[PDB]
Amino acid sequence: ADNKFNKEQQNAFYEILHLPNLNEEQRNAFIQSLKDDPSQSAALLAAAKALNDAQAPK
Numbered sequence: 001a002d003n004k005f006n007k008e009q010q011n012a013f014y015e016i017l018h019l020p021n022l023n024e025e026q027r028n029a030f031i032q033s034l035k036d037d038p039s040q041s042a043a044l045l046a047a048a049k050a051l052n053d054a055q056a057p058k
Contacts, residue, residue, distance in 0.1 A: 009038035
């Protein structure tokens with residue numbers, strides 16, 4: 001990763017990609033949005049994590 005995702009961007013990408021409670025649609029949407037804009041990777045990460053926690057099976 002270097003041309004699209006530098007470091008934290010790629011990390012956020014993987015984190016979202018590997019969120020256990022994040023369903024296909026959500027994850028793919030966040031991943032697509034991050035693929036489109038790696039700059040707001042942190043925003044998308046927090047959003048996706050919030051979603052992942054929101055859908056945390058309890």
